[PDB]
């Protein structure tokens, strides 16, 4: 085993699992999913005695069951339900990398609305709805709404979070520290427009979001991390085990 030494010992045998995923979405103004996928990886950080043979089980076999379009593993994994078998390297390492496209849970729905008022103003209203347990909080949310290049100024009203028109980025950036599942918030903005060449219209870029939620958008769930060390005198039940899920947006755009 060239990725793990032979006399490792710890009085506190413990492991931490990280299911990190980036969820990507391209949605129409309608609300139809034009494209969507999750890319994720499971990082394991373990302080286990000896040369443990572990078993990683998740809700594969495709209650809760998800489909994996594809995935690669760390060399320590023994290819051939059919779960993962390995003698992990010590410390932190990437156990596997995977991709999903089906039954993804979109944590946010963005519903935009624009009204043209003459040739002088644009009235914009954007509502965001969190789609996930109420007991879970999202954080680091950011909703970026593009403004036309002939913008002379912007007025915004938002009860939750803080929004700032950024003229150099040609966008109103709305930030929200935390937001629980099954909620709804909105921002209204009035975009003040300068005169422009009447022929060339505005090709509205998509509104885009950023956020971080504590669960895997793919649906993945860790069921168990079994540790067997036949030589040393600690077993599976002696091991303290934790898991955390950090799902973050990648490209999460909504055409408006």
């Amino acid at each position: 085993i060239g990725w793990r030494r032979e006399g490792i010992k710890y009085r506190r045998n413990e492991l931490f699992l990280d299911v990190l995923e980036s969820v990507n979405l391209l949605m129409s103004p309608q609300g139809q999913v034009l494209s969507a996928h999750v890319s994720g990886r499971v990082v394991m950080k373990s302080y286990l005695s000896g040369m443990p043979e572990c078993k990683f089980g998740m809700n594969d076999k495709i209650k809760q069951s998800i489909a994996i379009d594809d995935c690669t593993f760390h060399q320590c994994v023994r290819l051939s339900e059919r779960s993962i078998s390995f003698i992990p390297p010590d410390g932190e390492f990437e156990l596997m990398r995977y991709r999903t496209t089906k039954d993804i849970i979109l944590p946010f729905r963005v519903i935009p609305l624009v009204r043209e008022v003459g040739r002088t103003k644009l009235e914009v209203k954007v509502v965001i709805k969190s789609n996930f347990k109420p007991s879970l909080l999202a954080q680091k949310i950011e909703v970026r709404i593009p403004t036309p290049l002939n913008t002379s100024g912007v007025q915004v009203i938002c009860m939750k979070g803080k929004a700032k028109y950024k003229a150099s980025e040609n966008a109103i950036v709305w930030k929200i520290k935390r937001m629980a599942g099954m909620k709804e918030s909105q921002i209204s903005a009035e975009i003040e427009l300068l005169p422009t060449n009447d022929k060339k219209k505005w090709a509205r870029p998509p509104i885009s979001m950023n956020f971080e939620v504590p669960f895997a958008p793919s649906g993945l769930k860790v069921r168990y991390l079994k540790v067997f060390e036949p030589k040393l005198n600690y077993s599976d039940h002696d091991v303290i085990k934790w898991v955390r899920y950090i799902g973050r947006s990648g490209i999460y755009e909504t055409r408006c």
């Binding site: 504590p214 991390l225 303290i240 085990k241 934790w242």
Partner: peptide
């Protein structure tokens, strides 16, 4: 946050 895995 981390949660216990039984």
């Amino acid at each position: 946050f981390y949660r216990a895995l039984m």
